[PDB]
Design a protein around this ligand. Structure first.
Ligand code: SF4
Ligand code: SF4
Lengths: 234, 234
């Protein structure tokens, strides 16, 4: 069934740069269980770190719960992303991960994986780079939350999704918003009605076409202009 | 002169868990050059990744420059912190690092270090945990920027500095703000006058004493209450 040797996201997931034998060795330890249902949690905050989770297909959201019980989303993960890097420093998950649609996950036992990386230097370096890239994306999200207005925040979110789907071999132009608009506003710090009005405006300028949960980008230059700008003085 | 064997922050820096021989091996590759002056940059965005930087003493700030030329700070680094993790994924620094006071830095050549970690599993695991902890702190900063008001943001910033200085063996009670208040507001998304009024209020409740750049915490319980709360409805 599911194996890394026959995976289209291998170049963006954990087996990147591994040759055939290294790839066989890596794939042996990975486990594929029943599909993750929508709303099902991969782990809860405080759970013992057992395995990392790669996303064969679907959408995952990472979030924490404030002292007052409010959910705050910290990341959306697409196919090829690895979830659970924040759990290594203390062998315990400090966050929640929840599927937003029916999703296939690859469970990678962390201690066995780390034992393997001590024997496969390419895998070690790829793990390093993936953690570094998560750090980089978190820094970019910090800049988004600090310097971008509502228009710029939503544009950056949409451009980021477009480029990631394009990296995963999908259409760079049309893609589905698998997360609710409430979750988008939670992640960007906006209201749902603010998101709806911004989408209306984006469609009015013909930059986007919105049809249900499907987004069509018609002017990537204008979208990237709004996404790479921080023009809000405040 | 400067060696990891005679370093008080060894348990919080990179040589953690290394025995005597492993520690000798690690220390051999690390280089100590002239001290970093205030305002001097360790690297610029786009510089080739040559070495990571550990902080033997002083204060560093990481920041990026927006398309409109504005600086946005993403982190402050104290003694024992490692700077340059975001540069691994592409062997190139995506950010700037600048000293806020006279600082001593340990230059760790990254390729030699990664070659060593392929031979010393404890060091490999410690590098993993440090990157994981940077991810965790970035997630916490995202939550700060998303859910906390000005009062809560400043309280969390001050409590975080207090706990980190306490981890480094310093006073948990009194500490110096080596970064300017403008840089604090940049990092937290606040105005300098907002910061000054918040400090006035914190001093009015006797929770803090402010004297120049020195902060004295008198009620850690109240400070942690404000720091761990996200009570702003908006
Ligand atoms: S998603 Fe699963 S099968 Fe595909 S490359 Fe990643 S670990 Fe391998
Ligand atoms: S600051 Fe320098 S000397 Fe001290 S533990 Fe870190 S690398 Fe070693």
């Amino acid at each position: 069934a599911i194996h890394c040797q026959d995976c289209s996201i291998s170049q963006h997931c954990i087996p990147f740069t591994l040759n055939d034998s290294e790839l066989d060795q890596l794939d042996e330890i990975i486990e594929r269980k029943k599909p993750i249902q929508k709303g099902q949690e991969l782990f809860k905050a405080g759970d013992e770190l057992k395995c990392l989770y790669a996303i064969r297909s679907g959408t995952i959201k990472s979030y924490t719960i404030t002292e007052q019980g409010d959910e705050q989303i910290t990341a959306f993960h697409l196919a090829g992303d690895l979830v659970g890097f924040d759990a290594i420093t203390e062998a315990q998950h400090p966050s929640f991960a929840q599927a937003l649609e029916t999703s296939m996950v690859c469970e990678i036992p962390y201690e066995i994986l780390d034992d393997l990386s001590g024997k496969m230097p390419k895998l070690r370096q790829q793990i390093m780079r993936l953690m570094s890239n998560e750090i980089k994306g978190d820094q970019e999200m910090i800049l988004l939350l600090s310097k971008k207005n509502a228009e710029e925040r939503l544009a950056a979110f949409l451009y980021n999704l477009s480029t990631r789907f394009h990296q995963r071999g999908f259409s760079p132009r049309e893609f589905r918003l698998t997360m609710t608009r409430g979750d988008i506003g939670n992640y960007l710090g906006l209201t749902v009605e603010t998101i709806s009005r911004l989408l209306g405006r984006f469609q009015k300028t013909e930059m986007l076409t919105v049809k249900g949960k499907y987004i069509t980008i018609n002017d990537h230059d204008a979208l990237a202009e709004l996404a790479g700008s921080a023009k809000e003085i405040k």
